Amino acid sequence: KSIEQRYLELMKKRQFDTFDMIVESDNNSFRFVVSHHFEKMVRLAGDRYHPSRVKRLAQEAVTLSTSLPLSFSSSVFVRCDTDRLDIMKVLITGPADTPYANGCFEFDVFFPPDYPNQPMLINLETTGRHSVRFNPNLYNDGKVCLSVLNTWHGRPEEKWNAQTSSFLQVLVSIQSLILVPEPYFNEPGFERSRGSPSGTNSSREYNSNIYQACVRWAMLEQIRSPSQCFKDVIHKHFWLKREEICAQIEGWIEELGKPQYTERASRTISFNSMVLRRHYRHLREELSKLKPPR
Amino acid sequence: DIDESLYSRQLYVLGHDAMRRMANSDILLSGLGGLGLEIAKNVILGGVKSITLHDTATCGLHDLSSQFYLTEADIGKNRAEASCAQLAELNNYVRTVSHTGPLTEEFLRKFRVVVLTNSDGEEQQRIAKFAHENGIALIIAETRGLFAKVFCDFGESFTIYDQDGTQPISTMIASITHDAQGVVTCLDETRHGFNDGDYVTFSEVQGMQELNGCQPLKITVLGPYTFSIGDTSKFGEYKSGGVATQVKMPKTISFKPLAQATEEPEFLISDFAKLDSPATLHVAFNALSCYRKAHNGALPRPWNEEDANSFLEVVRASSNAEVDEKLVLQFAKICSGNTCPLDAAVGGIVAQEVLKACSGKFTPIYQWLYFDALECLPTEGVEEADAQPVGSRYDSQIAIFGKKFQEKLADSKWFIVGAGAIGCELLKNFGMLGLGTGNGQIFVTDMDLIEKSNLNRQFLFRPHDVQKPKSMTAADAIKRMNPEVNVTAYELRVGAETEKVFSEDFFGKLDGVANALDNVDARIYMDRKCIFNRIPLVETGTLGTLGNVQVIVPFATESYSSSQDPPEKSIPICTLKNFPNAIEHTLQWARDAFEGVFKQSAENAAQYIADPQFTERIAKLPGIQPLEILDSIKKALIDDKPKSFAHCVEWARLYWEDQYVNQIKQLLFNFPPDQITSSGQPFWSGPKRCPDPLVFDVNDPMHLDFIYAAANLRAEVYGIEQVRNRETIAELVQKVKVPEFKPRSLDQDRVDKIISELLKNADKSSKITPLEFEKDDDSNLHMDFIVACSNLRAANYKIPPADRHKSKLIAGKIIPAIATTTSVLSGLAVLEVIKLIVGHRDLVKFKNGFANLALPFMAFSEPLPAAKNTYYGKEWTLWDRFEVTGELSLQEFLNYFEENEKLKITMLSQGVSMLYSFFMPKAKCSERLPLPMSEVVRRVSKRRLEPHERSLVFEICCNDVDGEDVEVPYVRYTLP
Amino acid sequence: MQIFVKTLTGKTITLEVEPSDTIENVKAKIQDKEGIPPDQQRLIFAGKQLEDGRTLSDYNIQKESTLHLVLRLRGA
Amino acid sequence: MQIFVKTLTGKTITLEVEPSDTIENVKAKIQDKEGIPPDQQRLIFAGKQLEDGRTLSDYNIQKESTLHLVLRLRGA
Ligand SMILES: *P(=O)(O)OC[C@H]1O[C@@H](n2cnc3c(N)ncnc32)[C@H](O)[C@@H]1O
């Protein structure tokens, strides 16, 4: 079988699973055994829930158990608490031919008690301890930006809708609008500067920064210290494609070694290239240590 | 000025100008029955300059049905004189006096507004003529059993400064056409919301600068996103920018005198299903005086057929227009009685009208208002022998409902949630009704304490009752008002944590629940409890002059949770972070900065100081959480710890510099001010305002205020003594050196190192204390800091600043509230409670209420019936449920459902938990199958089962025999 | 036929509707003109609350009639 | 004649615009289907800009060509 076929067959079974995120504690309390961003909000919510929330979450789980996107280029994996459907973690792999390609990005999703009237809360965890801004819509503090996640006046088609909007819609919106091949033009106003040499140089600079950022955090840190919920899936994904990531990073290095027209962008590109070489040496060191999955 | 510490909630409804005008108005109130008492109470709580209570009748037993300030010992005394002493304590700023002399012409000249109740026809006509001839506002109010009548005559020329009370709406212009019919298009296809024929003004307009600060112009709404202002060819071409703001145009109207308005009345429709009722009620109320004159000043006897026929004949002789004879007979039958909720509602309406006359705000009634509550009576009526007086304080109530309904009321048990304004009014009405005076009881709960600002609208509390629990004080007050009332008070907050007291057995003996809460979570919880226990629930809610009542009847109507309300409006992340364009955004940003600086930055340090073994607990946390906590603790305890107030001032100056200079410079470096898109619109255009970094100036009051507030708060956080001297702060802040700023384009080892640093350098003798944001205190500098921060950020983006009033309204999430709306809504809710207690089940009798006293407006509608769904041909609603008894295993539960209901359970849940699912791990499924359901619930919920829990509620998603999903009712699992 | 819808806040709405149309269509028009989603609208006429699945003929809504768009409140 | 223009649902639909049609004309012919304002639309070809002043012929867009239409994508 082809390697893509093996990837698709192996990761199909593990798209939607449950994990023990909360365990019993003393004096009728509970504690989190995994690092969840919305733990404080979960504790504040307590046992409050809208009557329609249980039905909405059941329908959402039924949808996610079969309709999660899956491909050789990009895939989405969702893990939920074994006793609470309103606490979830999302892993999204970067689409091919993008600066995020073959990079594992982790999100924390918490459904408020007013769901589905209020949009769910999602926070990006793969930010390198708030030192990396992976996208204009992905602030380094972890906040994720989408028009679908806003109940603000906006437009009735673009707002969060109690009926038509869904968790799968939000995941697809992230996958299709945030991890774009050219993240620089995601910022409004900059979108119309494309096609100019200055815009191309700015996009190249941003892509060079994102390349090393993804190589360091989305790959090396995920391999070294994977999340407990996404350990085996990350291991399988990185073992099955290790030649592909090696080739893609080598191509990135060759692209970054090309001459630049402006010195201001050239210095940053060279610095990012050195940083990427330093990170790629470590990534090659770590990849060879991956024990092949059973 | 107006005492904001007392009228804080009422100011957001009325306004400074309106309150100033009411502070110079004298009120005369004639008649001190129940309706007069409610009018006087609401007016005094409003805060008029003075009120004079005039009455000629003496206190009697019948007056105790609605007058809560008279006792049996007051029988024989003048009502006004007896009630004046208790009425004065409501508000010390209002001078209250009692008058017993005749209403001479010279005496009437001293009052701006004159209110007439229980006055005869000739006196009413004379006083109305004198008031109209001398420019004195007159209001006539009457209550006869289950009927009401309100008349307003505010003079020949009355000016209204705010016709509806809604805040002006401002929109942003994208393009204006330059021709004879110039069309204004809003920004990025956003609805302006302007009404047809509105008046708007323009500002910040480039090119058409002549429109800046121009007089208001009549507009023509051409669509949801466009409108026309007329000919714009005389001005220059439009470049960009501009803000169009709605302007409230005053209106002048003329009020007909009573002697003229009687023949040609204009009716304000109270119920839209009874359009013909006011026409008949006008004639009935007019002919009541003739009947009294023809029967020695005696009203028709309660439920007497002969007297009803005589009154019908009098009505026929008095008027030639056709009238509803059945309505006339009913009115004559129940005209001699009196009830409390009706008096409260009409008193609230009349007090709002008095305030409108005094201040000139809101549109008054034009001109007659007639209301009835005939649905409260039994369908078969009341036997005459049952309505005879029995020498009791409820005689006026027995004259309406009879003795049997009084006995039913005495044995009724009702639960009131929340003891706020609505809760206090509901408690007063229930006590006056005689509810629970026999074998029944009245339960009231509230977790809050009395605050000074609460005294403005809560009349059950006194200035010396501050810091006392609300529920107990209200219970004691209504016990004083009526000694026969039995009340049990609790200091608990309703929820999952207080089910020990509010258990299933507590709700089992209840007959109904009245909601007086101020949040949605408590409302949903009370709805769930009422649905589970199958008891009626009455929901009340107010917002300024707006109000609503919803009645829920088991097996009859839908629940409060069946419908949805608009969600709370969130702010887009970038608008809060980098691109604010309104004062609300800056206020929210200031609140977030306050929280993050003074509360979140010190919680970990305080926990570490208080708990000696905090480090060992936080060393076991998963992920990078231990590092994120230790680094914050180190930063709060060593790096940023100030050793003196001068260090606090330096920190405040540096924080100001970073917040208003460095970040703005970085933002401008990222996006140049003159950045232009390819097609022509600038990047810093439309909703995007180009900022400019500020220059620090100690002479600027805003900068000094921010420095002072920030330094004082920082010193308070670290325990350093505050220095409340503005001159000292100004002197100290001038010596601070600001570093230059330029724009920019092993874990175990770390935790061990940081732990060593804390145990070596950090001192446990510090007094780290996070600050809790308090808004009603003017000495904690919280509001001053918030105002300074928001105004500085507004000046950063050229956003118009907001004063302390608007900042406190927005940042503090204040809900405006007034006493009149509370009284009206509580009266309506008590009417619905009476309807429920009677035994009505047809949805026609029940009426959901909606009111807006500003317009004024009030309408009613039948509650919607519960939605019907079918599974296997069996109809079910939200009130139906499955009944599973005994103790069964999870496998036994699934087998029971599969064998009996032919439903295959694919997802079983208990509240927020998930006991069973189709995608659960096989090991856990095998483990949970043989265990009892109680044990499974205990394991999944991670909490023990309390002894008071006698049953559990499960929600199931089931598949029929054919494999398609079907909606099924919830399951009530009875523990053995 | 032309009907008017009065919001609880006092703003007046003008609609162009022929009888026989389902409430859903009326709520859709009101949404287009103001912006409230259909499930957040409460229409009151002649003491009755308009429900989805019915037409104006059942409620006898004729020309120049007035409806009321009421809403619930969270204070107390 | 027939060319394809991208829509909301990811699918690309069949529309009757001309190379001689300006991008304003293309926007109008997209508008006549759903009422979407011309200024909301950004016509794009393989990630490259198209704007009102030009016609489709200047970008060699003709029969069987596809347009990646994105409705002036918004943000945070
Ligand atoms: P307004 O805010 O004047 O009156 C509301 C009162 O209700 C009390 N309250 C709110 N929420 C609850 C819960 N969950 N339980 C008990 N009492 C509640 C507030 O404290 C006000 O007194």
Side-chain angles (χ1 to χ4, degrees):
Chain A
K1 318 207 322 296
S2 75
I3 191 144
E4 160 170 26
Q5 179 184 3
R6 197 175 321 88
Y7 184 1
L8 288 174
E9 286 184 15
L10 191 70
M11 301 268 85
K12 175 64 179 172
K13 315 171 192 175
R14 323 307 311 293
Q15 283 218 276
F16 186 66
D17 214 337
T18 83
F19 193 78
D20 275 344
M21 299 194 194
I22 298 152
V23 306
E24 197 162 18
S25 182
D26 301 345
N27 77 318
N28 301 134
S29 74
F30 60 93
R31 68 172 192 93
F32 279 72
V33 293
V34 300
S35 40
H36 205 280
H37 178 72
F38 296 105
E39 164 171 13
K40 263 185 54 53
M41 302 197 88
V42 157
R43 289 190 189 281
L44 279 180
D47 321 330
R48 321 205 204 80
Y49 64 90
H50 204 272
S52 63
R53 200 189 81 151
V54 292
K55 204 57 81 145
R56 187 50 163 262
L57 276 184
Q59 292 167 205
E60 283 293 5
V62 166
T63 302
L64 301 173
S65 64
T66 57
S67 308
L68 277 170
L70 173 65
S71 72
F72 198 61
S73 172
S74 180
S75 302
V76 176
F77 308 87
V78 173
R79 297 285 184 277
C80 78
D81 186 72
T82 320
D83 319 315
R84 289 189 76 151
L85 263 173
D86 54 319
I87 301 170
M88 292 185 160
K89 283 172 164 286
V90 183
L91 187 85
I92 302 189
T93 67
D97 208 14
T98 83
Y100 318 96
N102 302 324
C104 297
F105 300 88
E106 173 183 328
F107 301 77
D108 288 327
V109 178
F110 167 57
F111 294 85
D114 327 293
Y115 190 80
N117 268 65
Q118 306 267 343
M120 71 275 288
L121 321 168
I122 183 167
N123 197 76
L124 173 70
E125 284 319 74
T126 311
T127 47
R129 312 196 190 104
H130 317 296
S131 77
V132 168
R133 182 165 180 187
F134 270 107
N135 193 268
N137 295 357
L138 297 176
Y139 297 92
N140 60 301
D141 64 359
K143 290 175 180 60
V144 180
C145 190
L146 282 178
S147 100
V148 66
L149 294 179
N150 277 280
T151 45
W152 150 78
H153 320 328
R155 176 132 70 89
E157 149 46 69
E158 300 188 338
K159 270 179 59 186
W160 174 257
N161 197 292
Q163 281 91 58
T164 58
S165 303
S166 65
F167 189 36
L168 184 64
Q169 182 187 63
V170 173
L171 294 184
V172 170
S173 296
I174 292 165
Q175 199 188 30
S176 308
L177 311 176
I178 297 187
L179 311 182
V180 293
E182 65 295 337
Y184 169 82
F185 298 116
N186 264 9
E187 189 75 73
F190 287 4
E191 66 215 305
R192 207 159 191 119
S193 76
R194 69 157 70 253
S196 78
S198 180
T200 304
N201 275 288
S202 308
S203 305
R204 284 181 103 274
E205 200 177 14
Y206 207 19
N207 289 13
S208 80
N209 171 40
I210 299 305
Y211 287 158
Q212 56 97 355
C214 155
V215 164
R216 177 46 200 291
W217 303 108
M219 311 205 188
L220 189 66
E221 283 293 327
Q222 298 276 20
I223 288 165
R224 279 181 175 154
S225 295
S227 184
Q228 290 306 307
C229 324
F230 296 104
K231 198 163 43 192
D232 79 310
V233 45
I234 275 167
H235 276 181
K236 282 167 170 162
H237 160 88
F238 277 116
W239 187 91
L240 282 179
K241 314 184 76 179
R242 102 175 73 72
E243 64 280 357
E244 179 55 275
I245 311 115
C246 261
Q248 149 196 311
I249 298 174
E250 281 169 13
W252 281 352
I253 275 291
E254 308 325 313
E255 195 274 356
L256 281 195
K258 281 164 190 172
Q260 306 301 325
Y261 312 163
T262 71
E263 181 191 344
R264 194 61 240 181
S266 179
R267 269 290 299 117
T268 315
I269 282 164
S270 304
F271 178 65
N272 285 330
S273 172
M274 315 309 334
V275 173
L276 199 136
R277 292 165 190 261
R278 175 187 180 144
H279 286 150
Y280 163 73
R281 187 203 316 134
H282 285 286
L283 193 47
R284 272 206 74 182
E285 289 185 28
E286 273 300 313
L287 278 182
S288 77
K289 301 167 195 166
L290 260 180
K291 194 294 192 182
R294 85 282 328 277
Chain B
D1 276 325
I2 291 327
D3 185 16
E4 298 146 289
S5 73
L6 176 60
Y7 303 113
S8 99
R9 309 303 196 249
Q10 183 175 285
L11 270 158
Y12 301 125
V13 181
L14 291 188
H16 282 82
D17 201 329
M19 289 216 66
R20 278 170 194 131
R21 273 184 190 113
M22 307 175 0
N24 286 283
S25 294
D26 302 295
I27 310 302
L28 163 70
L29 176 77
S30 181
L32 254 293
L35 170 63
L37 179 64
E38 319 276 9
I39 293 158
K41 168 207 81 194
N42 280 123
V43 159
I44 286 164
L45 286 175
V48 298
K49 184 181 156 206
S50 89
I51 174 164
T52 294
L53 319 167
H54 163 266
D55 206 351
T56 54
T58 56
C59 172
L61 212 38
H62 60 283
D63 287 293
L64 300 193
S65 70
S66 52
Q67 183 94 30
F68 43 87
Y69 278 165
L70 290 172
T71 69
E72 301 228 9
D74 293 305
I75 287 179
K77 309 180 198 170
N78 193 284
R79 289 187 295 186
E81 293 194 304
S83 58
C84 171
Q86 300 209 58
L87 268 198
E89 310 176 11
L90 287 175
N91 199 352
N92 294 297
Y93 293 128
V94 184
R95 164 185 157 263
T96 75
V97 292
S98 59
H99 187 68
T100 56
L103 297 186
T104 61
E105 288 190 355
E106 51 258 35
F107 177 64
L108 293 167
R109 287 175 190 279
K110 329 157 50 51
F111 304 106
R112 165 100 205 86
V113 190
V114 170
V115 189
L116 290 187
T117 85
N118 74 45
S119 299
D120 61 80
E122 168 278 337
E123 194 88 341
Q124 270 180 15
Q125 288 169 11
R126 178 181 71 83
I127 297 183
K129 184 176 179 185
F130 179 78
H132 193 77
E133 283 178 348
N134 288 270
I136 297 161
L138 179 101
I139 295 164
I140 297 178
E142 289 183 52
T143 43
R144 298 297 180 192
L146 288 173
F147 301 88
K149 152 184 166 183
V150 178
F151 168 73
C152 293
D153 168 31
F154 285 0
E156 262 302 315
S157 185
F158 186 74
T159 303
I160 307 154
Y161 303 113
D162 196 3
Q163 303 183 53
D164 52 46
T166 66
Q167 294 302 321
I169 40 184
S170 88
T171 189
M172 312 200 162
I173 311 89
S175 75
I176 298 179
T177 87
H178 182 270
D179 53 83
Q181 39 99 34
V183 159
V184 194
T185 309
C186 328
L187 204 31
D188 65 273
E189 281 303 341
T190 54
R191 299 184 178 81
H192 41 73
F194 291 157
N195 303 265
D196 182 351
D198 253 330
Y199 285 70
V200 308
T201 187
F202 297 93
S203 63
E204 309 174 0
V205 187
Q206 307 143 297
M208 308 216 177
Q209 299 186 335
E210 299 83 22
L211 296 209
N212 286 324
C214 74
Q215 294 308 73
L217 310 178
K218 152 86 75 174
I219 85 177
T220 302
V221 173
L222 308 184
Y225 304 91
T226 46
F227 61 93
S228 173
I229 87 160
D231 186 14
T232 82
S233 61
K234 320 319 192 63
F235 324 91
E237 286 314 309
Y238 166 78
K239 328 291 169 60
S240 73
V243 170
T245 305
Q246 189 186 8
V247 187
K248 298 301 178 153
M249 311 285 328
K251 185 185 182 181
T252 290
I253 67 196
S254 188
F255 282 83
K256 296 167 171 163
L258 170 69
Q260 181 187 2
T262 299
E263 297 83 3
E264 323 113 333
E266 30 262 48
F267 296 115
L268 171 66
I269 303 301
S270 64
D271 198 355
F272 293 92
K274 305 168 181 176
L275 304 105
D276 308 327
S277 286
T280 304
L281 289 186
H282 191 65
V283 188
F285 270 99
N286 287 345
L288 200 55
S289 183
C290 303
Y291 185 94
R292 289 190 83 165
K293 274 181 171 184
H295 287 76
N296 315 314
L299 288 168
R301 280 167 288 167
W303 293 99
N304 190 279
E305 213 72 26
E306 165 184 60
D307 287 1
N309 290 348
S310 304
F311 184 79
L312 172 62
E313 162 60 13
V314 166
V315 164
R316 282 178 185 156
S318 82
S319 175
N320 300 2
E322 312 315 303
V323 288
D324 193 0
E325 309 193 336
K326 185 171 311 304
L327 192 32
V328 168
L329 291 174
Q330 190 65 83
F331 176 88
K333 277 170 186 178
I334 67 169
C335 66
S336 52
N338 184 252
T339 207
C340 190
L342 195 46
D343 290 349
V346 193
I349 278 165
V350 171
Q352 190 65 13
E353 291 315 343
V354 167
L355 301 203
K356 292 180 188 173
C358 293
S359 67
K361 189 149 186 156
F362 312 125
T363 298
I365 296 167
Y366 198 82
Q367 266 190 243
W368 303 80
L369 163 72
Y370 282 100
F371 164 100
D372 71 1
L374 279 189
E375 280 79 33
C376 298
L377 289 172
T379 313
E380 65 262 21
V382 179
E383 156 69 48
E384 180 184 354
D386 191 30
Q388 291 312 307
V390 297
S392 180
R393 61 178 294 135
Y394 315 109
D395 275 342
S396 292
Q397 198 167 292
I398 299 170
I400 305 177
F401 298 114
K403 199 184 183 186
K404 284 168 186 168
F405 185 66
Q406 202 54 51
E407 302 308 312
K408 273 183 181 179
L409 272 176
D411 299 339
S412 288
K413 304 189 175 187
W414 273 75
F415 183 33
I416 300 165
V417 202
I422 303 271
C424 281
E425 291 275 351
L426 286 170
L427 201 43
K428 177 255 291 166
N429 288 349
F430 280 9
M432 282 335 287
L433 267 190
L435 205 147
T437 56
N439 299 289
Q441 202 92 354
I442 301 176
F443 305 95
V444 52
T445 192
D446 205 339
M447 80 270 191
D448 260 8
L449 307 179
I450 298 168
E451 190 45 66
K452 186 187 175 182
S453 56
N454 299 339
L455 315 178
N456 178 236
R457 62 185 185 284
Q458 295 156 17
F459 78 113
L460 284 183
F461 303 141
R462 290 298 172 258
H464 70 265
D465 288 323
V466 179
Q467 291 314 100
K468 293 184 189 172
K470 279 186 184 166
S471 47
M472 291 136 68
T473 304
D476 282 48
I478 78 145
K479 267 171 187 172
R480 298 176 221 138
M481 305 180 337
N482 188 6
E484 312 176 357
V485 186
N486 309 306
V487 180
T488 302
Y490 304 102
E491 312 179 50
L492 313 178
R493 160 207 310 264
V494 292
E497 295 93 358
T498 53
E499 294 196 347
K500 216 272 208 304
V501 179
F502 307 132
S503 60
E504 191 169 358
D505 77 56
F506 172 80
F507 284 104
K509 24 208 172 187
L510 284 181
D511 294 332
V513 174
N515 260 352
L517 309 141
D518 64 348
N519 54 95
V520 164
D521 303 78
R523 289 183 168 94
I524 288 168
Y525 175 80
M526 276 329 278
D527 208 340
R528 194 187 308 126
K529 301 319 287 313
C530 289
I531 281 186
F532 177 62
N533 291 283
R534 291 161 168 185
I535 52 180
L537 160 73
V538 188
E539 191 295 349
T540 322
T542 55
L543 173 67
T545 60
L546 316 180
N548 83 280
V549 182
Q550 178 167 9
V551 48
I552 293 127
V553 189
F555 301 105
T557 89
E558 65 161 30
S559 93
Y560 171 87
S561 318
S562 298
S563 53
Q564 276 293 5
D565 289 306
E568 271 305 359
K569 286 312 191 143
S570 94
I571 292 163
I573 275 298
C574 4
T575 297
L576 175 67
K577 187 90 74 173
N578 296 330
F579 322 108
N581 60 52
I583 201 70
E584 290 85 20
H585 313 147
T586 77
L587 278 158
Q588 184 64 55
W589 178 92
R591 178 87 172 87
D592 283 8
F594 175 91
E595 185 274 352
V597 161
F598 298 121
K599 167 143 171 304
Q600 213 54 28
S601 288
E603 293 240 50
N604 288 331
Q607 263 287 6
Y608 165 79
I609 278 167
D611 196 11
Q613 31 94 357
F614 189 68
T615 49
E616 68 97 7
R617 326 188 309 96
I618 69 174
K620 302 170 187 177
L621 293 176
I624 64 170
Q625 300 188 337
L627 278 171
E628 298 264 311
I629 289 184
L630 301 153
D631 266 351
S632 87
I633 275 174
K634 160 183 167 173
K635 164 154 180 203
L637 271 180
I638 302 171
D639 296 347
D640 296 356
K641 174 176 177 187
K643 301 156 298 316
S644 67
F645 197 76
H647 294 127
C648 296
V649 175
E650 165 175 13
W651 170 91
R653 174 68 176 85
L654 293 181
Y655 185 60
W656 184 98
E657 178 83 8
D658 297 281
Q659 291 310 287
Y660 308 114
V661 183
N662 292 350
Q663 301 340 288
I664 315 303
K665 275 178 181 180
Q666 177 64 59
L667 184 71
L668 284 178
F669 171 74
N670 284 346
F671 322 129
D674 69 339
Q675 179 152 30
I676 178 47
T677 75
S678 193
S679 50
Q681 51 295 32
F683 171 77
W684 289 110
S685 79
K688 289 201 113 32
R689 298 177 157 276
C690 190
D692 271 287
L694 302 181
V695 183
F696 188 76
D697 189 12
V698 75
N699 300 282
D700 204 316
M702 210 170 349
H703 305 179
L704 199 33
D705 202 38
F706 177 87
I707 292 298
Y708 171 87
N712 275 356
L713 288 175
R714 178 74 155 196
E716 170 157 47
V717 165
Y718 283 85
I720 306 164
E721 172 188 21
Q722 292 182 30
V723 179
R724 299 204 185 223
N725 198 328
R726 220 148 173 281
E727 283 93 352
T728 310
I729 284 298
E731 172 67 26
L732 279 171
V733 85
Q734 285 182 86
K735 304 176 184 177
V736 180
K737 290 300 296 312
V738 177
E740 67 88 20
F741 171 81
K742 292 301 298 314
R744 186 50 168 64
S745 66
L746 300 184
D747 282 357
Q748 188 59 48
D749 299 344
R750 305 163 206 274
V751 313
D752 297 321
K753 279 187 45 62
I754 307 303
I755 283 177
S756 185
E757 307 322 299
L758 278 327
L759 56 68
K760 168 158 48 61
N761 324 294
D763 198 358
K764 288 209 175 195
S765 76
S766 312
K767 299 87 171 171
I768 290 293
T769 298
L771 299 190
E772 311 317 319
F773 182 75
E774 180 58 85
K775 54 188 175 292
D776 53 68
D777 196 357
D778 273 318
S779 73
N780 56 14
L781 318 87
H782 295 179
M783 211 39 57
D784 301 74
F785 171 82
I786 289 291
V787 165
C789 212
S790 41
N791 279 342
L792 282 168
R793 188 161 173 92
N796 250 17
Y797 293 81
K798 303 152 210 313
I799 293 158
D803 55 8
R804 191 199 192 93
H805 203 234
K806 195 141 80 73
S807 300
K808 193 175 168 180
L809 163 69
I810 290 165
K813 284 183 210 222
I814 282 312
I815 301 71
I818 208 164
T820 62
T821 314
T822 294
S823 309
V824 174
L825 273 300
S826 301
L828 297 184
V830 175
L831 285 177
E832 321 295 8
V833 163
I834 284 171
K835 285 177 197 179
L836 279 164
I837 292 174
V838 158
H840 287 328
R841 310 272 320 181
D842 187 342
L843 306 193
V844 182
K845 304 294 203 171
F846 298 105
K847 286 177 184 287
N848 290 341
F850 309 97
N852 177 7
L853 302 186
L855 293 178
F857 174 80
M858 159 192 83
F860 298 93
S861 73
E862 288 177 31
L864 286 184
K868 298 215 82 85
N869 301 287
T870 58
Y871 71 103
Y872 289 136
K874 311 186 215 172
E875 278 189 332
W876 65 276
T877 60
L878 56 104
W879 304 94
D880 295 296
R881 68 198 177 196
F882 294 103
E883 304 278 354
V884 177
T885 59
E887 190 86 312
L888 311 177
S889 70
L890 181 56
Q891 183 70 79
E892 277 171 293
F893 193 89
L894 303 180
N895 289 353
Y896 166 89
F897 265 85
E898 177 57 275
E899 289 159 341
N900 293 285
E901 314 294 329
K902 325 184 56 47
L903 299 161
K904 202 217 153 42
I905 293 173
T906 61
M907 157 99 64
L908 163 65
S909 62
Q910 199 271 289
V912 302
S913 304
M914 201 185 39
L915 309 192
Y916 177 85
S917 66
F918 62 95
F919 57 89
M920 69 179 334
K922 306 302 307 201
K924 284 225 179 283
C925 186
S926 307
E927 163 201 325
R928 285 174 191 181
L929 272 178
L931 301 177
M933 298 275 334
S934 63
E935 175 69 23
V936 172
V937 166
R938 187 203 70 79
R939 283 186 194 212
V940 171
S941 71
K942 291 114 176 56
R943 185 169 34 63
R944 270 184 305 96
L945 72 181
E946 301 298 325
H948 66 77
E949 295 190 79
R950 207 62 34 76
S951 71
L952 303 164
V953 173
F954 296 129
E955 290 235 40
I956 52 176
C957 298
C958 299
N959 281 60
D960 51 18
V961 312
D962 299 325
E964 318 92 347
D965 200 7
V966 279
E967 247 205 305
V968 285
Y970 71 98
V971 193
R972 174 170 178 272
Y973 181 78
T974 293
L975 296 188
Chain C
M1 151 179 34
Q2 173 154 270
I3 69 176
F4 310 102
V5 174
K6 263 182 44 56
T7 314
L8 193 67
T9 41
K11 62 183 318 300
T12 300
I13 315 177
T14 295
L15 307 181
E16 171 46 278
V17 280
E18 88 299 323
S20 93
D21 35 17
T22 160
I23 298 310
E24 293 177 350
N25 270 347
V26 183
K27 297 227 209 172
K29 292 184 209 43
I30 279 157
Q31 160 156 51
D32 298 12
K33 302 277 292 280
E34 292 46 28
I36 321 91
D39 80 45
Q40 295 171 14
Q41 279 154 86
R42 335 177 88 88
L43 296 184
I44 305 310
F45 175 75
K48 313 303 303 312
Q49 178 164 342
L50 304 200
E51 41 210 314
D52 309 7
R54 325 282 301 271
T55 68
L56 309 187
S57 58
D58 324 284
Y59 297 105
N60 325 62
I61 301 147
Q62 328 152 353
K63 256 203 50 43
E64 211 176 30
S65 43
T66 180
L67 273 59
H68 298 295
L69 201 167
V70 304
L71 61 176
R72 305 188 304 199
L73 308 157
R74 82 195 67 264
Chain D
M1 87 321 284
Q2 283 324 330
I3 77 154
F4 319 120
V5 187
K6 200 172 180 70
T7 70
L8 182 68
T9 62
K11 210 73 67 172
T12 312
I13 68 169
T14 286
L15 293 175
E16 275 275 6
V17 302
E18 328 310 316
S20 56
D21 274 336
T22 58
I23 307 310
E24 180 65 26
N25 278 21
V26 175
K27 284 170 166 207
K29 285 177 172 181
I30 296 155
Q31 172 193 352
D32 62 38
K33 304 303 181 182
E34 61 181 299
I36 189 75
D39 63 358
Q40 281 286 78
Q41 309 163 43
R42 312 189 278 85
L43 281 293
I44 299 290
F45 182 84
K48 302 176 292 188
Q49 168 172 225
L50 287 157
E51 83 282 318
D52 314 336
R54 280 187 280 149
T55 82
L56 283 180
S57 75
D58 317 300
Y59 249 18
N60 77 72
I61 295 161
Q62 293 104 20
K63 194 62 211 83
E64 308 295 337
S65 307
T66 181
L67 295 181
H68 149 282
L69 167 66
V70 48
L71 202 76
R72 192 159 319 283
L73 71 86
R74 214 57 45 74

